Amino acid sequence: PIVRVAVLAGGRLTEMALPSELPLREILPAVQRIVQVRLSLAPIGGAPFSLDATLDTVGVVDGDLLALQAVPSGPPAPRIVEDIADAAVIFSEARRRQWGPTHIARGAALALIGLILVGTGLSVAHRVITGDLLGQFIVSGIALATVIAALAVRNRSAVLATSLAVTALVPVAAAFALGVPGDAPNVLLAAAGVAAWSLISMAGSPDDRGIAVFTATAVTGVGVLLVAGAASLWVISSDVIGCALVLLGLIVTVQAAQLSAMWARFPLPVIPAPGDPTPAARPLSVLADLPRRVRVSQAHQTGVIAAGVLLGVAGSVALVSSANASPWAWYIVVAAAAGAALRARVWDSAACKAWLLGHSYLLAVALLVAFVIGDRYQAALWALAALAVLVLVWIVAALNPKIASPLPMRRMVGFLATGLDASLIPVMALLVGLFSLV
């Protein structure tokens, strides 16, 4: 009738073999002699035993972990329990930390972003409005300091690093624009600066944060550079800048996912020759990196579509917004807008659909602010009316989810969506006068 247990006494548990059917008043002196006030054998987190009850009375079996502890002063201390029902708000009171040092970092980061924005704005207004060479010196100093700050902290933070690199391309694009005197031929160097800084900071990046803000500014800067190069060297009107910008937006909006999967550096196909290729398989070190490259491809695709929308509004606001241009321009503007609305039936990511359906909204807003800044104030009310029709056709599709739920009707909609970008570039030939030059 022997029960062998492990008795805890500096907390090194021994191994004992106690007799079971004897009262503890004789077992306890031998246990105090072997292992090492009324001490007694208690189970872990429990009350000590009745000192005259046997071990096969209380229910100790071979393998219990007893502990030597003193008997208390009379009450059993019955171990009360309160039932709770919504414990997920207790853990949510531990993640919701107080002020601490983790808020000062976000405050100082936001304050530094505000410094760079205000120091770009004031020191651009000190050169555009009136003043000497003091104004652009501050822009260039802020630009070079922000470039070395965003390139020096890429390994310590990688969130403040990409935020400083996003914020860095307003004083970079403002430092080279009004840096060179003269006038416009100055957007060439500003487009080169914002494209070069957007392509440098896209190299050492994680999976995200090489999102739309970088590759959209890169493709927008490359497009504005390739359009303004034709204005700096030659002499072209507003009916060529808008045509080249809308055509560039159409080109790198249509060829967007091919350009994304080229720019994502995928594990290229190993399509073999009909001779004796026997090519090696893709190793598992480059196959496990693939869910990062898919996210980089999706971010590059969203940015390429957003840059195509920004270019297709950036020249759409230069074809017709000057003063009463030809109705071919008033067709190309609506044709690019309706084309970028009809392309949203093709894609499947939500941010690309949002950037494609917001091209009409951005067009109405940009034509409104270009009618105001050009001092017309009569077609500005009509641009606001067109924006009102756009918000109304958003609302009717929103609150009534039957219009927004898509067999010859869809084929006719696709025929319109192919006819618009089929007929855009012939109207681009009608507009510039390239038919009339031959």
Binding site: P75, I80, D86, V89, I90
Partner: protein, 241 residues
């Protein structure tokens, strides 16, 4: 005391700009500025406000307390009761030990006060409603089991006592000589610990029915807060032990 420093500096700067003390226009304002800076200097106007509030007096359910009558009180049970300022995720606001020397039999009470704003979502997990009293009784039963285990006897009470007749509630400056010396036929002494029991901070009040280092309380709330069933803070600043 920022408003009184503001008004004192206002009257002083009114005195300083009053240099040509002629024809009693820049002399009456000098007299007003030297007669009003002496009434704002700030430890005298609070006496007038407390006297007016006493003349006004002569004409909750956010904090819940539990009380335990411990008969053979001791200093050695002061650790296990001071740890209840923050333990088991319940963070009681104040822990009060009150002795009453009415006659010869010193009756000792222990009072725990649980707030409902300080641990709002620590009670919102117990039910969809807030069981404030149902968990203040749980904290009281846990302290009763812990204190009954270590050797003493404790009993939960609900109709505790009367600290004021429905008389002289001084406050002490924080210690052991005053608490052993503080007569009349009824004497009350209350120690109150608050604030994170790794380093608690206490106040002590004491009523009789100035001895060594006492301080009388002019103008009663300090008597009505002295019963262990009070949800209040025994007004007066707290020292760090």
């Amino acid at each position: 005391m920022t408003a009184r420093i503001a008004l004192a500096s206002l009257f002083v700067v009114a005195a300083v700009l009053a240099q040509p003390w002629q024809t009693t226009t820049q002399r009456w304002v000098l007299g007003v500025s030297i007669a009003a800076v002496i009434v704002l200097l700030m430890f005298l106007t609070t006496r007038i406000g407390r006297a007016l509030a006493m003349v006004r007096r002569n004409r909750d359910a956010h904090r819940a307390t539990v009380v335990l009558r411990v008969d053979p009180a001791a200093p050695a049970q002061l650790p296990v009761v001071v740890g209840y300022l923050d333990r088991y995720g319940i963070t009681c606001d104040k822990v009060r030990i009150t002795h009453r020397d009415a006659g010869g039999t010193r009756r000792s009470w222990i009072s725990l006060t649980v707030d409902a704003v300080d641990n709002l979502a620590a009670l919102q997990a117990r039910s969809a409603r807030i069981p404030l009293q149902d968990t203040t009784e749980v904290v009281g039963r846990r302290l009763a089991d812990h204190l009954r285990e270590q050797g003493w006897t404790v009993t939960v009470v609900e109709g505790v006592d009367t600290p004021l007749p429905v008389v002289a509630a001084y406050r002490v400056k924080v210690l052991d000589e005053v608490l052993a010396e503080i007569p009349a036929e009824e004497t009350w002494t209350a120690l109150e610990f608050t604030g994170s029991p790794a380093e608690p901070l206490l106040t002590v009040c004491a009523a009789v029915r100035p001895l060594a280092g006492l301080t009388p309380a002019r103008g009663r709330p300090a008597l009505a807060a002295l019963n262990p069933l009070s949800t209040e803070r025994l007004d007066g600043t707290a020292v760090p032990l």
